[PDB]
């Protein structure tokens, strides 16, 4: 093939002549070392190239070779439970092949273990008519996730011969007489990262996701197929928010993208996720979790490549029928990458230096996520829940990243430094944080629980909002200017946030709190408040009305991993009733 | 025809060579080496070379083997009477996979400027069925009236209600509704679709859908398409059209995006600088022409930044658009649906649209006395703002029952409630 | 070995060389001046036979015709040997200690390479700083990235020296080192550091690099990269627990602003360059522990929130990058307490990995939660009383407010030259915590 000669090297920009046969946005091995790169603009026979590795030491005169294909990810068996480079290079194989503990330049790594032998059991029958997305057989990659092998796009015809057996990723396992010629396919397909995987139909997301986190599930819920943002200053709990919902969400698959963030965090995830097990099926969370690491030191172009690769994997496992949850750690790092790339290209700057297309790029990402009807005959339903972390400026969030983000998403968990400052570690701010799905979630919750729970959550939020007013009123006298009911209402709001709202301090029992327990917790709190108030009206006085059981706060911690919650939690209701009447 | 001389590709732009008879703002289509076909539009033409922007993008183009064909016409929309009951994309191409539509004729989408003398003033009001709009800042056929709201304030919900309950009392022929969705998410878009199907307005409406996923340059065309189709129905077919465009904010965002893509020097507050003219060109395609039956009315829905510091400046458009309607989340919090802050909303054309013979004429007098009741009723409760220790507590309770009653009842009539103007008047009488 | 005598342009501190080949980006160069002086520079942009270099020292006095440029074939390298300890260096790896040149074992690119995430080992164990607030409340872990934020003032500088001499691993380990990098400090600032090291006998334990304000701006960039290269080398080749301390990274990034301005890069926030975050990150993420090796690099960078402590780009980006913070407040500085540490803002995320029974005493984790809560509420009462008398304090808030006073007055202010062991900090905290009613606290004796 034709060889291109480097004629210019400026930062991460490389220009090379004699590249007529190349096309726009084609990966290419640039320089002697052959570092990976991408062609972003072509003028005459010369090409301007964006690289994804440090170009320190690359000069003019060196050769440039094109791969003739756009950025793509290998989609086949072996993906699950692996950590990848922003361009899908597997890091473990990377370490062994290079025999080094660092990241070098120019390494050629297949993303998937092509040599490993898998047992493929075929489900389609010979003679069946097939289309894009139709599933022919399944490989049991994990005891939990059955890797459903399905017909790629652009292929339609009649199967010819298909049989179960032991094949690798490269061996052809099935062949289809297509409209012209014969097409034999493997268990692996390549897919361009930037363009979304096609679907048949898109749907509304109306199934709440069980985060486990009390404040989220109760007050600001996100549905399966929705999108959420976590804006917060440093030291707030946004990274660990993604961690918790990656651990405990009732979702079949989890994809974690940590662009431009600390490496210890990714190392921590890969060590603790296998140690963490799930008793529902007896195996670790890594059997279902996927990882993509692009740290701060790693080159900046890979930071965009990392989030795009992550969602392409999520859309893959969505077309199988599973629900996926993908979370990007500090999407700002992506936007900050895109900004300096706009400046080096001397593009016309948009707002705050970011390119004008920022709002468009962002909108393309979140709208790839959703609850959809996947391609094929069965028309299975799959979903992707998108969680985005944004770290911006100081505490100030009104910057292009979060503003454009909130323009396209319906869930906003806003962390504030003051709440994290007071060691309210779940620092989701109430009264600003909002979930536009909350009204739909209420209907779902009432039908599933066969109880009026929506009115409970409106009552809880109304009490909290009331407390905000009473803080401004409390300046005059601490406890003698307010009203009797207002003092009790204060104590109830205090109980809500100090018991329900506050979440784990890396405590096993305080980490999850099942939906059934969430119900009982909020009910015991709400009954206490309303009983104490209505019973206070009948000549009961608050001086000693606060009495007896304050252990309720403490009580909510325990009885989680075992079903010891029913007795323990409703006994609190009956006990508080008795004690209220006795106090009289 | 089928020139094959691409000499440059930069970002989403292209440079073609040895082309002649190429005009500015002329549509081209590109034949790639892989037979894929993409549309683009000429944006600059030199002595022999020309420079175009590709809608879909430039990913995957091999310059040596790709080809370009110059269509010879600018962006057009095919007009037909069969448009009703149909859904189109940003560029007016069928999106519901329905019957193929043979255009009566293909129309340039930029439109034309009505001669000032030719334009006919609007004197007849339109019954929205909304007490908080009909009584006060009333809407007249041909008026340019916009609703300003923040995200999640139910602005879309109000827009839906207006679409469903819009009608006129004469009703010799029924109303026609053209709805454009500009750079909005699927969930947002789906809301409108579901309402129209459920309510049956799709058979009585025509719509153009442009989501955020779609390219920015398609957003520019989306308004132009909707208004060109509205004008076709309105003037050539004499229909009475209500045009509702949802979030011109993102039209403006796309305007900035295209300006930066074309390497144009920014105008005031980082925006293109021809925003005033671009918006005014859009908004001024309304009203009635004398000597023609039809009419065009516009209710542009606009997301409003809480701050006045940045986005599609409310007063940039507000003085272009003959009044405005304000929605606020502070309002919305206490079950106030449709949350219409009535303090700063006005319909610039309310006075003439209101009179006996066009309205039951308690209405002008009663609106003015209830406008006094707005001011005095606000005085009574609204102005207190947790103050009024003595004010309104001295048998001004008539006042200190009026306005809270008014704010709750009148403003929140319910999103699925249709109030006949006479009724709205009556509930004003009750409040009197 | 080639000397090029063709220089087409000189513009401020940047010059361009015509008719050259075989050059590479970021390469170094040496200029032969007409008078024979030698200046070091580095290439910034290359195309075809033209090269674009920027001289560190400056272009003043350069006759273009009678001057030439040499291409060294390599980028910024620090020569490394295990004799670094005891010899004091400047920002460019040169000797500032009146010492003989080292026989370099090998030459290392200062930029180094990223630690592969799986190969990395998570931070653990406990390093004893001698600081009650640091060791107890905001624990330090090997490979952690803990910084010091202060107002412009004396507290930071004193704390830097104190940490350097006292900070030792709990005896268990075979050996220990410290690497000191000094950025944008006056000659006296430098001499204070060097004299305390010579006087305390820690100079033999440690390697240090000194860069001053008079030295060129680009040298400040080089200096941290040098220091971290040597620190990496010691931990990851010679298996020592390296501890790196850096001085006023504000001075470092003001060098970045000056440099970018010279290169006409577009500004970011507050005039600082767009790539501030990642650039800071490239230094800070070289700390940690590698799997399959012993010895580690731990970084305690130092910085002042410039001017009014607004937490402006320098501190905010650093906070995003590090794993915690220790900050100094001028209100506490005004008061007698030294070091002035407001515990509430300060935080160490990895504290729990380095604490508990075994590594420390079993009570270490339970004590800090109680002392934190009691401080916050004693200060709550403290400010509460203000403009409301002591009546509101009543009995409970009164004891609480005085707890806060006592806490700041002896627990926190160690004195700048007095070491505290972890056990005596804990036991002191107990004596301090004994004032409180045994009913309030969170766990049993
Ligand atoms: N349940 C919890 N929720 C949130 N934060 C918590 C919780 N428990 C502890 N923390 C604290 O949260 C901090 C970690 O938050 P983290 O999200 O990692 O910071 P961050 O905002 O992501 N920094 P960055 O992502 O780089 O901008 C630590 O100091 C923990 O002590
Ligand atoms: Mg983080």
Q: Total domains of chain A, how many?
A: 4
Give the DSSP E fraction of chain B (strand runs of 2 or more residues): 15-25%
Distance between the ends of chain B: 73 Å
Rg of chain A (CA only): 28 Å
Write down the overall geometry of chain B.
elongated
Largest interface, Cβ cutoff 8 Å: A-C, 56 and 63 residues
Structural class given helices, strands, pairing of chain B? alpha/beta
Binned strand content of chain A: 15-25%
Our count of helices of chain A gives 17
GO molecular function (chain A): ATP binding; proton-transporting ATP synthase activity, rotational mechanism; proton-transporting ATPase activity, rotational mechanism; sodium-transporting ATPase activity, rotational mechanism
InterPro entries (chain A): ATP-synt_VA_C, ATP-synth_a_Xtn, ATP_synth_asu-like_sf, ATPase_a/bsu_AS, ATPase_F1/V1/A1_a/bsu_N, ATPase_F1/V1/A1_a/bsu_N_sf, ATPase_F1/V1/A1_a/bsu_nucl-bd, ATPase_F1/V1_b/a_C
Binding site for ATP (chain A): 232-239
Enzyme class (chain A): translocase
Please provide a written account of the structure.
- The structure is cut from a larger assembly and holds one copy of chain A (584 residues) and two copies of chain B.
- Chain A has 584 residues and is an alpha+beta fold.
- Chain A folds into four domains: 1-71, no CATH class; 72-115 and 186-435, no CATH class; 116-185, no CATH class; 436-584, no CATH class.
- Chain A contains 17 helices and 28 strands.
- The longest helix of chain A has 22 residues, at 515-536.
- By secondary structure, chain B is an alpha/beta fold.
- Chain B has one domain (1-432).
- Chain B is 30% helix and 22% strand.
- Chain B has twelve helices and 21 strands.
- In chain B, the strands form five sheets. Chain B has a seven-stranded mixed sheet with strand order 8-15-14-16-18-17-10, sandwiched between helices.
- In chain B, strand 14, helix 3 (186-199) and strand 15 form a beta-alpha-beta unit.
- The longest helix of chain B is centred in the middle third of the chain and has 21 residues, at 216-236.
- Chains in contact: A-B, A-C.
- The interface between A and C is large, with 56 and 63 residues.
